[PDB]
Amino acid sequence: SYVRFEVPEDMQNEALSLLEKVRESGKVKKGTNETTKAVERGLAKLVYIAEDVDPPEIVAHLPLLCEEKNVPYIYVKSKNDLGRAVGIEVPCASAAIINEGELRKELGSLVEKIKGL
Amino acid sequence: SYVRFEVPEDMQNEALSLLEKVRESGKVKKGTNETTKAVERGLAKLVYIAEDVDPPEIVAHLPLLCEEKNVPYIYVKSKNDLGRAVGIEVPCASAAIINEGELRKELGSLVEKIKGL
RNA sequence: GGCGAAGAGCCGGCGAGCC
RNA sequence: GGCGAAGAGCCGGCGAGCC
Incomplete structure (x- = not known):
């Protein structure tokens, strides 16, 4: 499996709520092709990877x-x-x-929390 | 009809035979999508249009x-x-x-006879 | 009701392969 | 054999539309 670490549920809820609100005033890529290219192009601020993806x-x-x-x-x-x-x-x-x-501040706090784990 | 002029049957046979042999030592584009783009790009020396094409x-x-x-x-x-x-x-x-x-001369002569129509 | 981010259909490049 | 130059599929691009 591709899952490198465990994420607490409440931090996950924080992440999805943030993504929901960001779609309203920011820009989000959706789908593995768009996400990977966005990362490869140097554009991605935070990527989400589902845990129940099969095949991995x-x-x-x-x-x-x-x-x-x-x-x-x-x-x-x-x-x-x-x-x-x-x-x-x-x-x-x-x-x-x-x-x-x-959502400057909310994203910043979330990313500090990911790196802290 | 989209057919702008009448082409004698014998000119049709000469044209298709020459085309047949040309595939071997020259280069031919095949299908309207490739041909139209090639002519529009300015590279095509002579194009073939079927008369029984539907829809026109x-x-x-x-x-x-x-x-x-x-x-x-x-x-x-x-x-x-x-x-x-x-x-x-x-x-x-x-x-x-x-x-x-x-086939430089043969193509040239064919094109002069086409202009003759 | 169906299909669809496990990529819809549309575009560029190639231009005979796929089951 | 079915589909296929009325565009097969491969690559790039957009990124939610098509029945």
């Missing part, structure tokens, strides 16, 4: 590229929750915040 | 585009004859010789 090879490359580019990434239980948070009626294996909009 | 709007733009680009064009009865001559296993609505290989 859809997203298994995503964590290492994110490590090489020093871009924080977080895990969420279900592709359904991530799909709901980006608001595209279907499950979603990975996503990314590209522009934090007006 | 598939190839109806080619004659005038070829005129705009000053490219000589000839008509052949059936997309079947053109498809066999360009050597595919399905019908073909239009084609083009872009580089004459070893």
Whole structure:
């Protein structure tokens, strides 16, 4: 499996709520192709990788590229929750915040919390 | 009809035979999408348009585009004859010789006779 | 009701392969 | 054999639309 570490549920809820609100005033990429290219292009501020993705090879490359580019990434239980948070009626294996909009502080606190684990 | 002039049957046979041999030492584009783009790009020396194409709007733009680009064009009865001559296993609505290989004079003479119509 | 971020369809490049 | 130059599939691009 591609999941490198365990994320507390309340921090996950914080992450998806943040993603929901960011879609309103920022820019988010949704889907593994858009997310990976956004990371590769140097644009991603925070990427989300679902934990129930099968086969794992859809997203298994995503964590290492994110490590090489020093871009924080977080895990969420279900592709359904991530799909709901980006608001595209279907499950979603990975996503990314590209522009934090007006949610400077909330994003900053969240990313400090990911690096702290 | 999108057929701008009448092409004698014997000129059709000469044209398809020459095209047949040209695939071997020259270069031919096959299908309307490739041919139209190649003429528009200015590389095509001579294009073939089947007369039994349906619906006609598939190839109806080619004659005038070829005129705009000053490219000589000839008509052949059936997309079947053109498809066999360009050597595919399905019908073909239009084609083009872009580089004459070893047939410089033959292509030139053919084009003069086409202008003669 | 169906399909769809496990990528919709559309575009550029190649231009005969896929089951 | 079915589909296929009326564009097969591969690559790049946009990134939610098509039945």
